[PDB]
Ligand binder design. Structure first.
Ligand SMILES: Nc1nc2c(ncn2[C@@H]2O[C@H](COP(=O)(O)OP(=O)(O)NP(=O)(O)O)[C@@H](O)[C@H]2O)c(=O)[nH]1
Ligand SMILES: [Mg+2]
Length: 176
RNA sequence: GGUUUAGAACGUCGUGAGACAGUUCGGUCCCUAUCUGCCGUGGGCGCUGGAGAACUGAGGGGGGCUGCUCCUAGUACGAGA
């Protein structure tokens, strides 16, 4: 427990991957307020939640349309020091994302519970198994009317060839 | 202020006086309301002995517009926007 091997062990550096518009960038902004980096928060395109607070999608064109290239982040949560990446969704667009995976020891996949598993979701798992990299799964968008979370588990096991272990479970979806 | 008076000029027409549904500058707009109506306000009598109060409510009138924001929710919808 020397001041060296202690700093090392308390660190944790990970990805965040998605099919385009799943919510990487949003869950990221929220992860940032659980780290006391953003005292308020925002949305995307600076949209529906007002205030010139978008944000932390670096660049510029990102804020005009929707997301471009990996923003990177370091903040403290609980007993750890997290290093957070923000991987772009789009076939032609990255690249980069792939090279970014080279910097992560593990990885979190966001899934649109209203959409299930999409195309670049499937392609991203292939790239993942290249390094036997671990995957956390987050089922985003429970504010929306979604599919049966049972069926959502099938699509994840069947099409992504990986076991599902529910930690939490939604009670009602959409307006409920 | 416009434009159908009287002054004056331009262009135009006519020998001319004058003329143009061409133009230009100037140029007196009265009424103390009797009736109807309408807004208000009293007087009289009626209502069945006379009086002071408080009512019922037939009916009449006034009022009746709308923006933006927030919650639902950036949810339904949408590939997105
Ligand atoms: N209803 C709802 N909408 C969400 C949720 N999370 C994200 N969104 C919406 O989904 C859209 C996609 O946002 P974004 O975070 O850019 O997704 P992304 O995965 O970063 N984009 P990309 O995959 O292109 O990099 C946003 O407009 C945001 O409003 C959620 O939990 N619920
Ligand atoms: Mg993004």
């Amino acid at each position: 427990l020397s001041p060296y091997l202690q700093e090392v062990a308390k660190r944790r550096t990970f990805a965040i991957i998605s099919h385009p518009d799943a919510g990487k960038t949003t869950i990221t902004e929220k992860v940032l307020l659980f780290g006391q980096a953003i005292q308020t928060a925002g949305t995307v395109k600076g949209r529906g939640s007002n205030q010139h607070a978008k944000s932390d999608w670096m660049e510029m064109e990102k804020q005009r349309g929707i997301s471009i290239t990996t923003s990177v982040m370091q903040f403290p949560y609980h007993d750890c020091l997290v290093n957070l990446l923000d991987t772009p969704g789009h076939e032609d667009f990255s690249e980069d994302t792939y090279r970014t995976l080279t910097a992560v020891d593990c990885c979190l996949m966001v899934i649109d519970a209203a959409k299930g598993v999409e195309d670049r979701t499937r392609k991203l798992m292939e790239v993942t198994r290249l390094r036997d990299t671990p995957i956390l799964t987050f089922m985003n968008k429970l504010d929306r009317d979604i599919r049966d979370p049972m069926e959502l588990l099938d699509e994840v096991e069947n099409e992504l060839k990986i076991g599902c272990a529910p930690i939490t479970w939604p009670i009602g979806c959409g307006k409920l």
